[PDB]
């Protein structure tokens, strides 16, 4: 349901075993309750993309999944039809908890 | 040895520091913006500007080149012949010697020992984690603030374009289905005044940083690894390093642009021990304040010997008055 | 054997280093522009200027003109004698030998052994990487500064209009309709007196820029890989290329302008080691600089010996007062 | 062959290089500026003299006049005939010659062989690309330097004393400029693509081509001026190879120069003999002294 | 909605296996507040495409697809119709969803 | 309308093949804040019609559209009525909205 990807991208710079804490993305996407601040949220967790890359082979675990393209042009069409916030609320609360779990992310 | 050299300088036509223009034809010169009062509010102008990563490599140059000429020049890494910039990457767990001789990335005091450009202008490998700080600290080239702001206008870029003609073995020009890597090329050109203040502190070469003093009965004393001529050697040659750089051996396209170089005014301080560090020759005002910084620091009770060219400097205040750049270095290097 | 040369030359009713304009009837010279003291506050005027590359350009033109007359001198690139500065292009993989051999762009000894001019002058192949600085440099041509400074105004610019007649064989002018490949040709004159500051490094030719020296027990000795003959042979030509350089031989459309040209002043140091780079001729006291600069180098202990040329530069130092340039170029090959 | 001529000449009443004007009634001859020192400062002032242009238009009209002589003047374009300066038009891809024969723009090594201007003046292609440099140079006959310090004024308009120093490098005639020298085992020959007999009379004819140059035939406006016309001194060196170039004579200290340069230029080692007249250039050099201009070309043909 | 090229051309700077290693553009974009300097960061970012053009066929990649016009037509008036900055934002930041993904760009 | 052919010629001025690239006067023109320097760009640009003319049939290529006196002779009061820059900045990206678009040139 493209929602897994990016639940597990927002989790690898949330997890342990690395180095870049930024409990400040997660929280922008738990507390923005309009459109415009959700989407800016996502942007600040997905400008860290070259950072997980060039770091996940440093300890050798293999490299991130970030969501696929599909995953991306889904969310554009899942926010602009929510005119209530809602249901806003829903989905960013539901990607905020998808960012916290104990999988392994990476051996 | 803390010496603090600062003063005014006039570069003309020199394409020293290119941004390249992102890779393309029409190549640029890096700009910078100052801030300048002109006594209605302080704004911002773009004017072109060198860094000091320029100023610290020719250094590292300059050092390489007056040390490979001593007798104890076989300490260099081999790479530094080469000119490399480059201390240490990513993946190199070992080090290679001028004569090809493996060096390992721990216990730098032997690193120090065994390599000389690293001793003086640092060095840091990611995989060992070995630091050092680089003992020459480098200025940023600005133009002088009394110069732009007396000219009100003229960006001082020229855009002079100058393309590459070739042609085939019988002589055609060919068209853009053959290539024929016929391009325009355009390059700008800076002119101007502009001030330095390049510091060197060589107080702490061939010392490891992890203990610099040691104590054997309650007794300080600096902890030099090396043998003490080697590090007069070093000493002499980071002083003399200084020598390509008052003649017109800075920047980038040293072939083609050969800057106009000479030194409008310059003052030093050489001193024994910690001193404040000299100020700036961007500013219009930096000689009133130099000497009452030299003053208060002889009123503290520092022996520093100070220098001047072109500069009046007072006459209460002891200063020899030098007469090139060369000889400075040779006052510098009589107390060595 | 590093050659050190500056000075004054007159350059009068001259289009040197033109523009080009685009392919059309107004053809002018580049400008430039530069910033003069002019006793009250710097100020930034424009004057037509020469670039350095193709200073460099012909430079190279004499070496391959003054070293194929050698009998060394087989070993060329074909681009030599047609007298092109191009030396390599994105898509050349290899480069084709004067008497019709093959040569790869590897093993840098090898492409410095059998290629002399891109020994001394550099390359780069960018497929391979392969890399070699100049190992002469270029100044740029400006017109002293104490002459702007009197001519106050005076544009230097005379643009002359001269038009090519063509006729049929029934001798009509024509129209536009007909073409008569009539077009009017404008093209602007410059005078004046300008200075140059080429200098010359010719201590590390025929050395791979990778290894420039090697140590068989402990001791340096350079990395020669050549034959010294052909060495010398280099040394020599190189030297006596200053022939077509001080009599008329810089700029550009020497067919149909042939400058006037003459030696107003020159001074030169050779010394054997790492020597500063000399004072530019373009500021009005040079000589003074150029006298310290001389003097103090003695003083600090290098075996630097001065050449003049219409400057007395005093009485206490040792300075051969040579007579012209090709006598000169003499005194410096008396040392090889 | 490397030859050098310069001298001092004295120009009276004197209307050539007109500039046009458009066709209007007014038309003024050129004005140059030129800087003299006059020992009180470099000072710019604006005097009447000949560019290159024309100058080297009259060396093609000369040259092209004294070839048809001789029996090799059948390779030859039908524009030098007419005494054209154009030499190749913008969208012109061939060329004819007087024959009828049609030449193409590829090879430059037959570009070369079967033209006559291309192959001594040079030639320039625009849509192939072919193109050669010019073996003449031609300099600007500036005035006098001595003349204008000590006129104080007397605009003339023109008349007074001027100088030239042109200058001909027709040693590389007849070989292409693509392959100038060849190797056949490790030995350099001239690539001379023309049988020798046609390089040597290239090389008289252009050597005599000197004599519709001091005999008051330069300028524009002969039909009507005529200008008084009589050598007053000229010096000039052959060589064999590479020479440093003869100075111009606007210069006033030009004597000291020329002994200078051919003294030192004998003491490198290098076939220097020099032609002089009403010029003493010393007397410890070897100068042939001419008095005359028929007898100097002579003595230049002598040895080819 | 003619985002999708110009999140490619703007991910064609910043994707890996491409040694132009400079995301200024997309951050100063992302953080516009009027109406010229969202345009003017835009066509900054835009001016490097003769670099990806002539940079591509060195690797062996298949060239960048640049921008189509009806995109560059289209973004105009949508900047055009809204006045308030709060619509202002939302299309000035739009554009950066598509840097930062993990698709194949060097097949 | 009135900014579709500007922008064509100024896209003709750089593009595909027509080997003459001046990325100075564009540049000065999207950065220009006076009107003086936005005149002075516009002068730049058009110094060089009579080279892309020449050029049009060196390669075959379509002569270029060389821009109506109207367009200017209009610009020369729609440019000289405001008082301050802000009013004209977007203006000059205006100007530059066609400097880099995907136009058959020559098709």
Redesign the interface.
């Known amino acids: 349901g493209w929602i897994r990807n990016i639940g597990r991208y927002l989790s690898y710079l949330v997890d342990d075993t690395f180095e870049e804490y930024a409990y400040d993305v997660v929280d922008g996407i738990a507390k923005a309750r309009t ?2 601040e959700l ?2 949220g ?2 600040k967790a ?2 860290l ?2 950072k997980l ?1 060039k770091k996940a082979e440093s300890k050798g675990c293999p490299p991130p ?5 599909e995953d ?2 889904a ?2 069409e899942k926010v602009e039809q929510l005119s209530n916030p809602k249901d806003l609320r829903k989905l960013a609360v539901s990607l905020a908890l998808w960012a916290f779990a104990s999988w392994n992310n990476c051996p | 040895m803390y010496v603090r050299i600062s003063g005014r300088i006039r570069l003309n036509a020199h394409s020293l520091n290119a941004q390249g223009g992102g890779g393309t034809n029409y190549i640029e010169i890096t700009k910078t913006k100052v801030t300048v009062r002109t006594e209605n509010g302080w704004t911002v102008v773009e004017v072109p500007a060198i860094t000091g990563n320029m100023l610290k490599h020719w250094h590292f140059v300059g050092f390489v080149d007056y040390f490979k000429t001593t007798p104890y020049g076989v300490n260099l890494t081999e790479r530094a012949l080469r000119y490399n910039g480059t201390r240490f990457g990513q993946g190199e767990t070992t080090a290679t010697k001028a004569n090809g001789a493996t060096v390992q990335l721990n216990d730098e005091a032997t690193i120090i020992k065994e390599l000389a450009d690293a001793d003086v202008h640092g060095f840091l490998a990611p995989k060992t984690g070995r630091r050092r700080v680089s003992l020459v600290k480098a200025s940023f080239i600005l133009p002088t603030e009394d110069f732009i702001k007396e000219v009100e206008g003229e960006r001082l870029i020229t855009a002079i374009k100058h393309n590459r003609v070739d042609v085939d073995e019988k002589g055609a020009i060919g068209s853009s289905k053959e290539g024929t890597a016929q391009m325009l090329f355009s390059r700008e050109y800076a002119t101007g005044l502009y001030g330095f203040s390049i510091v060197l502190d060589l107080g702490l070469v061939g010392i490891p940083q992890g203990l610099p003093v040691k104590f054997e009965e309650n007794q300080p004393r600096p902890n030099i690894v090396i043998d003490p001529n080697e590090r007069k050697a070093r000493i002499e040659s980071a002083l003399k390093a200084l020598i390509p750089m008052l003649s017109g051996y800075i920047g980038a396209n040293l072939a083609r642009s050969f800057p106009v170089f000479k030194v409008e005014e310059l003052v030093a301080i050489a001193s024994e021990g910690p001193i404040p560090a000299l100020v700036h020759g961007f500013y219009e005002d930096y000689i009133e304040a130099n000497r009452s910084i030299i003053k208060n620091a002889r009123a503290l009770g520092f022996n520093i010997e100070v220098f001047t060219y072109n500069v009046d400097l007072g006459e209460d205040i002891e200063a020899t008055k030098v007469s090139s750049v060369e000889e400075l270095v040779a006052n510098l290097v009589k107390m060595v």
Do not use: T
């Open positions: 459109q415009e989407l800016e996502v942007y997905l400008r993309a070259p890359k999944r970030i969501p696929s393209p991306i042009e969310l554009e």
